[PDB]
Amino acid sequence: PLALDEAAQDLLFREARTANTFAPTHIGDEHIEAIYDLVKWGPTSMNQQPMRVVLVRSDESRRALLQHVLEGNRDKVASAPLVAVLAADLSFPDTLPRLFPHAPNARHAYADENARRESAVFNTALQLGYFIIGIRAGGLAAGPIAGFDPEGVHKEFFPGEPVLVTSIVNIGYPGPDAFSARLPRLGYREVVRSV
Amino acid sequence: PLALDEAAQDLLFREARTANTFAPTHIGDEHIEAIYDLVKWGPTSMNQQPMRVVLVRSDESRRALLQHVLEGNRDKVASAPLVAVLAADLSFPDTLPRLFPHAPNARHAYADENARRESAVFNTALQLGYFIIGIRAGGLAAGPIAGFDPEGVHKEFFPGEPVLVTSIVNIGYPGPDAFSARLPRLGYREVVRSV
Ligand SMILES: Cc1cc2nc3c(=O)[nH]c(=O)nc-3n(C[C@H](O)[C@H](O)[C@H](O)COP(=O)(O)O)c2cc1C
Ligand SMILES: Cc1cc2nc3c(=O)[nH]c(=O)nc-3n(C[C@H](O)[C@H](O)[C@H](O)COP(=O)(O)O)c2cc1C
Numbered sequence: 200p201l202a203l204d205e206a207a208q209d210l211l212f213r214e215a216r217t218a219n220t221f222a223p224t225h226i227g228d229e230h231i232e233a234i235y236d237l238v239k240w241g242p243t244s245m246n247q248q249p250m251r252v253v254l255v256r257s258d259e260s261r262r263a264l265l266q267h268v269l270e271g272n273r274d275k276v277a278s279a280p281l282v283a284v285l286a287a288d289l290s291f292p293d294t295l296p297r298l299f300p301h302a303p304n305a306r307h308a309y310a311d312e313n314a315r316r317e318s319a320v321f322n323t324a325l326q327l328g329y330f331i332i333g334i335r336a337g338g339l340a341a342g343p344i345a346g347f348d349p350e351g352v353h354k355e356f357f358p359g360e361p362v363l364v365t366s367i368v369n370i371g372y373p374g375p376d377a378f379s380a381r382l383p384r385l386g387y388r389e390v391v392r393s394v
Numbered sequence: 395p396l397a398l399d400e401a402a403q404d405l406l407f408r409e410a411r412t413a414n415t416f417a418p419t420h421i422g423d424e425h426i427e428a429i430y431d432l433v434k435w436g437p438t439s440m441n442q443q444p445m446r447v448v449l450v451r452s453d454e455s456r457r458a459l460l461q462h463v464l465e466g467n468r469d470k471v472a473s474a475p476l477v478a479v480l481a482a483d484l485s486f487p488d489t490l491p492r493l494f495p496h497a498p499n500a501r502h503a504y505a506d507e508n509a510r511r512e513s514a515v516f517n518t519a520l521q522l523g524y525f526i527i528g529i530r531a532g533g534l535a536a537g538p539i540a541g542f543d544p545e546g547v548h549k550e551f552f553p554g555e556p557v558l559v560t561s562i563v564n565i566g567y568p569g570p571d572a573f574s575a576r577l578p579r580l581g582y583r584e585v586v587r588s589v
Contacts, residue, residue: 200428202533207402211527212435230395232582237396239579240407241523244540246577252586260589298578321560324516328523331437332406338397345439356589365516382441383493384434387427391447394455394551 211335216381218340219275220374226281228254230337231370238333243322245299245308249291250326253356255282260356267351268367272344279342279369284352285327286362287319316363323365334370340377342369406530411576413535414470415569421476421534423449426565429528436524438517440494440503444486445521448551450477455551462546463562467539474537474564479547480522481557482514511558518560529565535572537564 201208209215231254239248255264261282268276276282288294292306292315299305309315327343334341349364357364396403404410426449434443450459456477463471471477483489487501487510494500504510522538529536539562547559 200425203531217437233395242412254588321519324519325523328520336398393449
């Protein structure tokens, strides 16, 4: 009962895997633009789209990033031809007059700092979900990484900005032995119930 | 430079919209099963997949849900043939010996309650993004809802369970006048930069 055809199902989900090694082949800016142009449409609360991205391309910036990556993740991050650092824009409310223009008081739903931060991180995580699918849609492999120090990455790449660094995503064509055996997924009956 | 074909791009993102009205047509359990079977493969940190789902299908449960939904969202939530309530399993570390078996001490990364809650919510948000794409992959329309009282919903549908209710998703075939004009999206140059 799926409308999405099987080949698309395989590319995005069924045969898509997290890459642990990458080919060094350069990933072009035009490639990432095409991915963003596709998945920017994925919905966020009040269209608030708080995700901001820094493409850590140069060896210089990659070495600066690696000092904040846990040792067990440095192999992958160092070998990826492209690394995306995602941060949640804590000033997203200021964009709502133009992004959610028919509710002019929308920004004020987030006057509380905790509510603003929690909404920024939640919708940036939502967008990370879209982004992972978008990377796969671009024929590439995604290797998300949470084992890093967000404060150091903030100082390094977003100094003085009102953001919350949330994620690192290795992007590239897979290298040799990039994939380990698929791990378990919970059964439907363990996850879903009806009332 | 997208490997995903154009028809799939349109179904999942480019021509997919958030539905504000729904046809009453019943959505069967097998339909949701096919959707979960597809998007359960979407990756989460340490394979921790904390999303848990209650399908609020019956009128009885829907009325109980609606008391916790903000006035301005009751119209949508009441008319959807199916509503999914998403919660983050705060006890997900207990499942890691099984789900992330090659790292037996993984669960101790979440000894701290805030670290555990933040991880549960972040990865449930990731899974919500996959789930939205999956609902569209199933030929349906998704209508996510954040304007509700999470504690009230927890008491109704997850009483005494160690979860954090995070999101409501209206699911169905779209009704008449389900969609308004697409809103703006930030430019690539506003979201992404390189170093
Ligand atoms: C996490 C999330 C929460 C949302 N909560 C509400 C809500 O409470 N009320 C509402 O009317 N729409 C809600 N929406 C719908 C968004 O406003 C909508 O998806 C966004 O404006 C983009 O619209 P589009 O998908 O048609 O392009 C929510 C969307 C998301 C992603
Ligand atoms: C948010 C997130 C953070 C992750 N962080 C790490 C990490 O720090 N180190 C690592 O080796 N893998 C990391 N991963 C990869 C996950 O372990 C992996 O995606 C999961 O085990 C599923 O693998 P699969 O896509 O091949 O099925 C992360 C994945 C996600 C989604």
